[PDB]
Amino acid sequence: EPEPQMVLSPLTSAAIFLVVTIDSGGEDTVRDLLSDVASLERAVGFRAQPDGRLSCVTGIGSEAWDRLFSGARPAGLHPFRELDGPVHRAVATPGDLLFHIRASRLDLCFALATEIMGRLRGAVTPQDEVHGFKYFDERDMLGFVDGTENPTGAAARRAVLVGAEDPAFAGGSYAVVQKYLHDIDAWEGLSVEAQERVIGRRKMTDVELSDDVKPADSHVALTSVTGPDGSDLEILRDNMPFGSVGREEFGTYFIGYARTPEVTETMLERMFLGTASAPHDRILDFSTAVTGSLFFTPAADFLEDL
Amino acid sequence: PEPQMVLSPLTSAAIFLVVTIDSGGEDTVRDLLSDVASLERAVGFRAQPDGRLSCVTGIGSEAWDRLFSGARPAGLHPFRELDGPVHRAVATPGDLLFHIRASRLDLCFALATEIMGRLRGAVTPQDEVHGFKYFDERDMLGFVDGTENPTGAAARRAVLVGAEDPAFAGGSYAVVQKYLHDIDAWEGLSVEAQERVIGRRKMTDVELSDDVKPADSHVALTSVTGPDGSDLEILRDNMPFGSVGREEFGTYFIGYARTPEVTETMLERMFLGTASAPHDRILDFSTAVTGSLFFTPAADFLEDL
Amino acid sequence: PEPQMVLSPLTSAAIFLVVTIDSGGEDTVRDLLSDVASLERAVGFRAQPDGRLSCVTGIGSEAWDRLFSGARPAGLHPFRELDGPVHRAVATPGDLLFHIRASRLDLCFALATEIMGRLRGAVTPQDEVHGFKYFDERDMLGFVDGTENPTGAAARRAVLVGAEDPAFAGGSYAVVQKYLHDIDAWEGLSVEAQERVIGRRKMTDVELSDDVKPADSHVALTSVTGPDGSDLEILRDNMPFGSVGREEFGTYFIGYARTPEVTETMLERMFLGTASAPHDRILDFSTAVTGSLFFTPAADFLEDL
Amino acid sequence: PEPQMVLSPLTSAAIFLVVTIDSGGEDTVRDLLSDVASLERAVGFRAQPDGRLSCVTGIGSEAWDRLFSGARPAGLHPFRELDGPVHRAVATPGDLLFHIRASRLDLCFALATEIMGRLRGAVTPQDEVHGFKYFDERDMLGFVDGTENPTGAAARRAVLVGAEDPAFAGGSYAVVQKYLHDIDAWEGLSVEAQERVIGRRKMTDVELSDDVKPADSHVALTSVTGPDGSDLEILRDNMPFGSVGREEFGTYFIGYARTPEVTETMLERMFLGTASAPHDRILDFSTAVTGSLFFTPAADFLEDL
Amino acid sequence: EPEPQMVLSPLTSAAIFLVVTIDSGGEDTVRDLLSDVASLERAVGFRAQPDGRLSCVTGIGSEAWDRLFSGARPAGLHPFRELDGPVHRAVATPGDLLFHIRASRLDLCFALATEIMGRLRGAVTPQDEVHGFKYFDERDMLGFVDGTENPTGAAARRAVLVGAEDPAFAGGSYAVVQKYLHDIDAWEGLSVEAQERVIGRRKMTDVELSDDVKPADSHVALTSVTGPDGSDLEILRDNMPFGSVGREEFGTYFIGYARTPEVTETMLERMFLGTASAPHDRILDFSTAVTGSLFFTPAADFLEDL
Amino acid sequence: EPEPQMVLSPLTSAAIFLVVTIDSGGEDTVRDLLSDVASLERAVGFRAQPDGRLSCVTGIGSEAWDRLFSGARPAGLHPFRELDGPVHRAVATPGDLLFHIRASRLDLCFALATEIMGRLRGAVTPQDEVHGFKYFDERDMLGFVDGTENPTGAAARRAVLVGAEDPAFAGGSYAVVQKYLHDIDAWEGLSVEAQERVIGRRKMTDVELSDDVKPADSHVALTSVTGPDGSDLEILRDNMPFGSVGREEFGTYFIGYARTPEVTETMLERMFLGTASAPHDRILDFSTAVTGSLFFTPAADFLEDL
Ligand code: HEM
Ligand code: HEM
Ligand code: HEM
Ligand code: HEM
Ligand code: HEM
């Protein structure tokens, strides 16, 4: 049985997201580090038993996969697909390796990131680094509770882990990342009731709007997708807030895990390109994506066996 | 099948709500049942990771027949009043049970508010108790309460319906009784005399030897063996409650079991007695003022309505 | 002079008990008053360092005359009923107040049990509320409640009797009112309209600017400048309480001040209005169902009798 | 088969008790063994949810034959003394092991008190150590200790007896050794020299790379592969202990494994060395003063007595 | 203003009590350590802020004082006085220095004890070392809540700290220590109600027995002492449980702080020698003192300025 | 009478440091914000009682003081003095207003910073923003415990608050800030013993090196200063780590409070210009100051009485 990485684990109060590209000639250094990442996680993490909750999920992009490995590839691994809507665009930006590092304290995340990057210096170029923090009662920078309808238990396993559809890569997952910045000035121009209509849930109490008042171009409406067989298509989101007050940067770092990119891409298409009933997701009128990358997060034993 | 959170541990706060369904309110109730898990997530997610909010929803026998057209769970029936020579276990109205737990009362109250907001005009409240942890898991009689609950696999076996009733697998049966205690009488006993009523040491919670443990002690009467030698177990999530001004010192009893027959066997022994015991001595200091039985279906049963 | 714990912060749990003294109950009460500090330590020491148990004991005007001869506190009088054009602040009976707080309800309940056990047959309960923290220090209207309470030296100056009444230095005066809210009406307002009722932003708790704050908003009416230009302040320890099944969503108001005149001035503005404001708009959603005044003596007063 | 809590994590407090069984003590011991799980619950339930009390009970080779008729676990034998050219792994008496862990020492102490109370007059104590967490999971040599323990499925595979000995499935083997350290000699080494003794970086706990890791380093010598190319793993629940007055700075070693052969292989490598290492350098600063081997049966084996 | 040592600080969950004698010729070593002890306490303690709560209170015995210092001695400092009752005895045992180390965790206590003893090695001989631990809800090994009637606030300051009566030593205090071992076998044979009559309070609830039921030879009656002024004489007790289950050692480590030894001495005299109304304190029928020592704990500035 | 700002408060797990300049014409907006900052601190902080521990200390620079206020100036207020050593330089950088925001959680800090900067938009220009985090057991990025010798209690009050020497500004303090970046690659090539000789304390245990082995150019030797009266000159440090792993930015944000800037300036002179026995503080061989500013932090009531 393949052991997954920690893709099913819960939100934490601190996170570091690091995205790098692999420099020409840096492949051997990267493969050696991949084989040791679990050992590094334990080395740091054991220090803060029992409440540290340190984990690291490592993802590899399509272009990078083909530079690192030979043989079969995961069935759905491709570069992030840029979505060029009439109004809003989802950009593709460079990224070969993702390290999604979580803990209950930032120091543990920082210590592990330090160890990883120490091993990679001179082999990679950093592309993005975000230090995420919990904001009040699991809110995002738009002031709404964010993560509520994540799947749990068996449903999460079924939504997130590769299975018999791609048996050589069972136990893996696909992660899509996008860094979003928000236009807080425009957002705060809206009444609370108008913001609720953009999201599709009540702001303070986080209760979903009734189907009779929920707009068709609300975020919740557009990201609710059912498959041809009537099943709900779900993803697991580990979004974190971030920002810088003096630069007026207020962001949401989006990261979504799913057993095939087709689920997450369907959601993104609905948001950016719209449906017969909605031109686009109204959340995008206040949110700009500035990065966009797709990664395969292999089963943990795949990494170990390097 | 995914169960509701019937296996989850005791918490520091709880709200127990029992309502009856008004004639005409059935549709509203089915709508609400389909959404209860949603509402739980809406409130609970706000307080990850330490909130530990849960809600277990149960449905009574008469309500079942009013709400659903298909098969009935095999063990589902009205609570059976037990008319003992001295003490009585009353059967009181209740169609729907919401057993709400969290580490803080606010989460319980917020969720209860949302549930009741959806049911207003469809149901009549019968009982509402706000329970609280009392020191080191003590009840209002001063004893640790819940010690011999089953855990892990033993709990699953004792609590969850399985292949004996396969269309309802993952469900469970809850019996509730609200008890009020006569604390004046109880406090007139010595500690040793109280230990003989319960069957355990008061301060340390160690079981009395079989040599010393009276036949009519509570632990003796609620220890039941099956014909296959094995102990019959239930999972109890009792909480204290009360009002000092009204001299109300209570234990809210709630017991979960894979069949009601187990919890009914224990109640029979308590109230009706055995060869060796007229009745459970705990009932000399405890009066049951409610009594209701519910089936708590698997979570996917409620979602699919 | 050692004050009672009138300056201590909000806690997550409280019990408020208000009783009247039966005729012939005086001596039993006096004996209890002399022991209440001892009882608080008896229970509270069990939960050091985090229990934070306290009990503040207050005595009403009529009761004062029944219990004690000699000097009366200068400001002590029965709560004054306020009969406004639309809203009324009722005066209800109460001779003794016990304001019990802790970080856990069990500690409060244990202490209340001890106190009432010592008073049984000498007093009659008038009110009992069990308050709980609601999210991030919110009240049942959904606003952060207590923000502008004074701290440090400013609190001491606002709350404790000093040289103006030297025999009773270190005392304070408490006004209590139990309020029930009309949540259905309140929830009919937009958040922006709610903010204009209160005078602060709802989610972020920032005060509205003076150019937008309505004259009949709550913050506007309860901001009162004294003879010297400075704000007259009180210390509020309001707690939410309620019952979902009875649709009872409440705020237990308790405010401490060095003279009742401050609190009474605020009440008059709220209920009777001013030239600028008909009445406090919070009262269009909030009904007072009790109203009592108490003097809370210095701790050494109680210890000596 | 329900295992005892041999797979559970390190805790901040522990008591290790080793005793021998006196003449005629067998019946008393068998009665205790049947009740030990009940005693754990008695104490443990008091400190839900965070007490994390557990007790693992082990029985030695000679004791097994005195207590039980019928089959013996395949791997149970007396601890094998190893007399190396420089260092010795001593064997000392021990019939019963109690490995008691919790998040607080009180819980461990209370359970140990109850156990020893039942055994008074039937057993002679041989060793008692009260262990405590030291900073960030450090040992008395200043190194993080426990990092490479197996977890999850790998831990089950490494620790629990399976189909190779089916009557005893769910059991495990525990080896204990009390080590005292020469802290003066240790503190005479540079940090970098200490890291070469252990095989990991001192502050950050990162393993030295293979190019730099000495062959007589502790991590090198206790890394063993079976013929399959499989890593042989044990689960260590080591705790620091000591007495400053007596200059007693210790490590209480306890390691669980599915067969004693794994742990014995490691001890042989440490004490007797390999082709490339005379002995483990950790032993130049560490002296074993006890050594015993126990079998820890499945929990239901004990309950069935 | 004299700065006291942490003699007013509350009970903690962990404690080490160390008593040593000063070997011949060890005086200079000890004086240097005394000047450094606050610095050692910060060196260890700062690592664990804000919740470590580490403190160390250093005391010096009467004989040791004369060996260490010339000039003024504190007025109340003398060797502990042996009390030879008809039945029970309070023994006097050697002790020149006391270290009363407290924290929320035993590691901090142990680390600081280690640094202290490492500096005193070869200059001192250990006489006693006890590792105390909190037992449930502030109970002692007899199962009673212990510490309830300790003074707080200004009442504690008045009771504990030397003031104008000995101005050269203002902000000091006096500590008496006794290690007690209990006969738990005998104690656990009593009914709870009989135990309550020994102590003077309710066992489970910790409420004081009323005057009309409390026995004259109960512990609470014998340790309640009114001064000339008709006011209560008070001490501050930081008693901790300790023991070893194999040796049947179940102990109370008594430590009591007071502004003058006369207060603690009066209490001990009542307990061990009794009154007109009581032969002795019934607690002593289940408790044997095996050490007894008296220390002065100077103001912190005294130690640093030597 | 005078209530200080929270300059005596302890270290917390999270901090934001914001330094801004006041734009031409920004003065009135700033004065209005200064009068409201306490109300904003309460608006956010009350939400998180009792464990949020939110505070904000507001400082004003020398040039800004004269732009903002008429009448008396604090006696010690002047621009930060650049120190140009032979090897190392302490740079002076622009800064009119300092907001030192601390809490147990970063969200509270970020929320309050957001409210302050929202009021100042168009009136100020940000110069520096640092989000500090606790690193293990109060360590800095050099791996040493940092803060140990801070004064406490009465000694802190005396070291930090202005008193009768400047009675109009009694209850204020002076803050010096410097953002340091560390050369961790160079630092990590030193043995632990060599690092200990740079700092002047044992790395793991934080015990001070004895006076025989402590190098005269060690950090602790150079920042140990006695006044003419023989007494130690003390400051209160609230230094926090910060960093970005991808940029290899590993920093110490230095902030030191004192009753007069002369104390802190003497320390800086010793560090940067050295003594007869030490060319400069060895810590500076691994640490570069990239900001340097001096602020007066007035009593709370001074800000309010605007
Ligand atoms: C731009 C920043 C984003 C923000 C601030 C945001 C915020 C939210 C919020 C507040 C909710 C409702 C509560 C919850 O269930 O989590 C929500 C739901 C959801 N979001 Fe987003 N979201 C963002 C981007 C995305 C993206 C890019 C996707 C998909 C690619 C996505 C997929 C979802 C899904 C599947 C749900 C659950 C809908 C349901 O089944 O009820 N979100 N998000
Ligand atoms: C006044 C109401 C009740 C009180 C205060 C109470 C209290 C207790 C206490 C103190 C114990 C011993 C510790 C423990 O194992 O939990 C106990 C055990 C138990 N009670 Fe009750 N109980 C009550 C009602 C009931 C009822 C109505 C039932 C069953 C219908 C029940 C079933 C049990 C069971 C099964 C045990 C475990 C006995 C054993 O296996 O040792 N109890 N209860
Ligand atoms: C229905 C009952 C009440 C509710 C729900 C309520 C709620 C609030 C809220 C939300 C605030 C703003 C935040 C704060 O500073 O605490 C506030 C402020 C205040 N309330 Fe009330 N309150 C009630 C009754 C009263 C009463 C009866 C009094 C006085 C007799 C009073 C006096 C004050 C005062 C003095 C302030 C501070 C105003 C300022 O200076 O900004 N409140 N209340
Ligand atoms: C003498 C006292 C002992 C001390 C202080 C000690 C300390 C340590 C330390 C610091 C580590 C490295 C971190 C870790 O992975 O836990 C380690 C690893 C280990 N120790 Fe020891 N140990 C001792 C005795 C033993 C004994 C007696 C055994 C086996 C019979 C043992 C088996 C192991 C194993 C298997 C590892 C993991 C090696 C690896 O796979 O990396 N240790 N020990
Ligand atoms: C590179 C920036 C800095 C780092 C990493 C740093 C680190 C340290 C460390 C590790 C200590 C020893 C433990 C302690 O007592 O806090 C220390 C002490 C000290 N530092 Fe620094 N420091 C730095 C800059 C400064 C600056 C700029 C000053 C003064 C202007 C200063 C003043 C002090 C003082 C007064 C002490 C206490 C000395 C004693 O009395 O023992 N430090 N610092």
Tell which residue, D237, D287, D230, has the closest CA to residue D262: D230
Say if E254 falls within a structural domain.
yes
* CA neighbor of A141 nearest in space, from A184, A195, A77, A94: A184
- Interface C–F counts its CB contacts (< 8 A) at 32
CA dist., res. C240 & res. C144, Å (int): 11
Contact C43, C152 (CB under 8 A): no
Instruction: Kindly list the partner chains of chain D, i.e. chains with 3 or more CB atom pairs below 8 Å.
Output: A, B, E, F
From A136, A195, A165, A120, select the one nearest A258 (Cα to Cα): A165
- Residue F174 tokens read as 């002076």
Residue D44 lies in a domain: yes
Who among B136, B146, B154 is closest to D47 (CB)?
Answer: B136
CA of residue B182 to ligand 2 center, whole Å = 17
Q: Is B218 exposed, middle or buried (0-12, 13-18, 19+ CB in 10 A)?
A: buried
Minimal-distance CA residue to ligand 3 atom 38: C219
Residue pair B61/B78 in contact by the 8 Å Cβ criterion:
yes
- Chain B residues interacting with chain D (CB cutoff of 8 angstroms): 9-10, 136-137, 144, 146-148, 152-154, 200, 204-207
DSSP structural state of residue E259 = S
Nearest residue to C103 via CA among C192, C225, C233, C10: C10
What is the rounded distance in angstroms from the CA atom of residue D112 to the CA atom of residue D98? 8
DSSP 8-state secondary structure symbol assigned to residue E10: P
- Could D109 and E135 be called an inter-chain contact, meaning their C-beta atoms sit closer than 8 Å? yes
- Has residue B5 been placed in a domain? no
Q: Are F99 and F113 a contacting pair, CB within 8 Å?
A: yes
Amino acid identity, position B2: E
Contact C177/C245 with Cβ under 8 angstroms?
Answer: no
Separation between Cα atoms, residue B31 and residue F95, nearest integer Å: 61
Tell me how many domains chain A contains.
1
Which two tokens mark D254?
């306890």
Domain range enclosing B157: 13-303
B119 and B28 Cβ atoms separated by less than 8 Å:
yes
Burial A76-85 (b: 16+ CB within 10 A, else e): bbbebeebeb
Closest residue in D to B135 (Cα) is D46
Residue C1 lies in a domain: no
Which amino acid type is present at position E146? D
CB contact under 8 A, A205 and B47: no
Angle at CA C105, nearest 5°, toward C103 and C106?
110
CA D144 / ligand 4 centre spacing (Å):
10
Residue D3 lies in a domain: no
The answer to whether E271 and E284 are in contact (CB under 8 A) is yes
CA dihedral (A151, A156, A160, A164) positive or negative: negative
Distances (CA, A) of F259 to C24, F71, F78, F174, F231: 63, 21, 14, 6, 15
Report the SS3 class of residue E108.
Answer: helix
Question: Do the beta carbons of residue E170 and residue E164 sit within 8 Å?
Answer: yes
Question: CA nearest C124 in B: which residue?
Answer: B245
Task: Return the half-sphere exposure (C-beta side, CA atoms, 13 A cut-off) of residue B147.
Answer: 25
CA distance B261 to B277: 21
Joined tokens for residue C296:
């809370």
Burial class (CB in 10 A: 0-12, 13-18, 19+), C227: exposed
Judged by CB atoms closer than 8 Å, whether chains meet at B106 and C130 is answered as: no
Nearest to E15 by CA among E166, E189, E177, E150: E177
Q: What is the DSSP letter of B138?
A: B
Q: Exposed, middle or buried, A68 (CB in 10 Å: 0-12/13-18/19+)?
A: middle
Closest to F40 in 3D by CA, of F105, F108, F124: F108
Alpha-carbon gap, residue F108 to A135, rounded angstroms: 8
Q: Mapped to the 3 state alphabet, what secondary structure does chain C carry?
A: CCCCCCCCCCCCEEEEEEEEECCCCHHHHHHHHHHHHHHHHHHHHHHCCCCCCEEEEEECHHHHHHHCCCCCCCCCCCCCCEECCCCEECCCCCCEEEEEEECCHHHHHHHHHHHHHHHCCCEEEEEEEEEECECCCECCCCCECCCCCCCHHHHHHHHCCCCCCHHHCCCEEEEEEEEEECHHHHHCCCHHHHHHHHCECCCCCCECCCCCCCCCCHHHHCCEECCCCCEECCEECCEEEEECCCCEEEEEEEEEECCHHHHHHHHHHHHHCCCCCCCCHHHHHEEECCCEEEEECCHHHHHCC
Technique of determination:
X-ray
Phi, psi (deg, nearest 5) at residue C8: -75, 155
- Residue B4, domain member (yes or no): no
Q: Please compute, for residue E264, the number of CA atoms within 13 A of its CA located in the half-sphere on the CB side.
A: 28
What are the respective helix, strand and coil percentages of chain F, to the nearest 5?
Answer: 30, 25, 45
Alpha helices by DSSP H, chain E: 27-45, 62-68, 106-120, 153-160, 184-188, 192-199, 219-223, 261-273, 300-304
* D140's tokens: 């008395």
C14 closest CA partner among C127, C141, C172: C127
The alpha carbon of residue F306 and the mean position of all alpha carbons in its chain are separated, in whole angstroms, by 25
For chain E, how far is it from start to end, CA to CA, in angstroms? 18
Separation between Cα atoms, residue A145 and residue A201, nearest integer Å: 9
- Please indicate whether, in this complex, the C-beta atoms of C46 and E154 are within 8 angstroms of each other: no
- Count Cβ neighbours within 10 Å for each residue of A225-259 and write b for 16 or more, e otherwise: beeeeeeebbbbbbbbbbbebbebebbbbbbbbbb
Which active-site residues of B does the annotation give? 145
Rg of chain F taking only CA atoms, in angstroms: 19
- Evaluate the omega torsion of the peptide bond into residue A279 and state whether it is cis, within 30 degrees of 0: no
Beta carbon of D148 within 6 Å of any ligand 4 atom: yes
Distances (CA, A) of C74 to C61, C69, C82, C233, C293: 11, 14, 21, 19, 13
Q: Helix, strand or coil for residue E184?
A: helix
**Start-end of H helices in B79-160:** 105-119, 152-159
- In degrees to the nearest 10, what's the CA dihedral of A44, A47, A50, A54? -10
Rounded Cα distance, D58 and C29, in Å: 60
- The answer to whether residues B116 and C244 touch, using CB atoms and an 8 Å cutoff, is yes
CA distance E22 to chain F (A): 23
> First-to-last CA distance in chain B?
15
Whether residues A207 and B41 touch (CB distance < 8 A) is answered with no
- Which of the residues C139, C145, C216, C237 is marked catalytic? C145
User: Residue A204 is nearest to which of C190, C192, C203, comparing CB atoms?
Assistant: C203
Q: What is the DSSP letter of B97?
A: E
Asked if residue D49 has a cis previous peptide bond (ω within 30° of 0), the answer is yes
Residue E120 in 3-state DSSP? helix
Separation between Cα atoms, residue B210 and residue D3, nearest integer Å:
27
B148-161 burial, b at 16+ Cβ within 10 Å, e below that, comes to: bbbeeeebbebbbb
- Is the CB–ligand 2 distance for residue B252 below 6 Å? no
**Which positions ≥6 away from B254 have C-beta within 8 Å?**
B16, B99, B174, B175, B176, B236, B237, B238
The residue whose CB lies within 8 Å of the most ligand 2 atoms, and thus the one to mutate among B136, B141, B145, is B145
The Cα A296–Cα A61 span in angstroms is 6
Q: Partners of E251 in the beta sheet?
A: E181, E242
The partner residues of A57 in beta bridges, in order of sequence, read A100
Which chains pack against A, by 3+ Cβ pairs within 8 A?
Answer: B, C, D, F
Distance B198 CA to ligand 2 centre (A): 8
Question: CA-to-CA distance for A222 and A88, rounded, in angstroms?
Answer: 15
Q: What angle do CA D119, D124, D129 make, to 5 degrees?
A: 95
Q: Which helix (H) or strand (E) holds B32?
A: helix B26-44
At position F135, the amino acid (one-letter code) is Y
Tell me how far CA of residue A27 lies from CA of A96, A124, A128, F42, F246, in angstroms: 11, 9, 20, 53, 18
Question: Are residues F163 and F170 in contact, defined by beta-carbon separation less than 8 angstroms?
Answer: yes
The values of phi and psi at residue B303, to 5°, are -65, -40
Give the angle subtended at the CA of D214 by the CAs of D208 and D220, to the nearest 5°.
Answer: 75
DSSP chain A: -PPP-STTPPP-SEEEEEEEEEPTT-HHHHHHHHHHHHHHHHHHHGGGTTT---EEEEEE-HHHHHHH--S---TT------EE-SS-EE-----SEEEEEEESSHHHHHHHHHHHHHHHTTTEEEEEEEEEE-BTTTB-TTSSB-STT---HHHHHHHHS--TTSGGGTT-EEEEEEEEEE-HHHHHTS-HHHHHHHHSB-TTT-PBPPTTTS-TTSHHHHH-EE-TTSPEE--EE--EEEEETTTTEEEEEEEEEESSHHHHHHHHHHHHH--SS-SS-GGGGSEEE---EEEEE--HHHHHT-
Tokens of C66: 């029944």
CA angle centred on A53, ends A49 and A54, rounded to 5°: 100
Q: Determine the Cα–Cα distance for residues C229 and F177; give it in Å rounded to an integer.
A: 38
Query: Which residue in this structure is represented by tokens 């013929």?
Result: D227
Q: What are the beta bridge partners of residue F241? A: F252
Question: Any idea which residue has 């619950």 for tokens?
Answer: D41
Helix (H) or strand (E) holding F65: helix F62-68
Contact F101, F113 (CB under 8 A): yes
Whether chain E lies against chain A with 3 or more Cβ pairs closer than 8 A is no
CA–CA gap between residue F252 and residue F290 (Å, rounded) = 11
Helix (H) or strand (E) holding B258: none
SS3 D191: helix
CA atoms B162, B167, B170, B173: torsion sign? negative
Is E9 contained in some domain? no
Contact across the interface for F10 and E115, Cβ inside 8 Å: no
Tokens describing residue D23: 């003449």
- CA–CA distances in Å: residue B192 to residues B188, B201, B208, D100, F41: 12, 8, 11, 30, 57
In this structure, are residues F60 and F67 in contact, taking their beta carbons and an 8 Å threshold?
no
Neighbour tally for D215: CB within 10 Å:
12
Q: Is residue B8 part of a domain?
A: no
Please, what sign has the CA dihedral across residues E138, E140, E144, E146? negative
Q: Is B239 left (phi over 0), alpha (psi -120 to 50) or beta?
A: beta
Structure-token pair, residue B2: 């995914």
Per the annotation, the verdict on E146 as an active-site residue is yes
Pocket test for ligand 1, best of A83, A237, A255, A257 (most atoms within 8 A of CB): A237
> Which ligand is nearest to the Cα of residue F49, counting in written order?
3
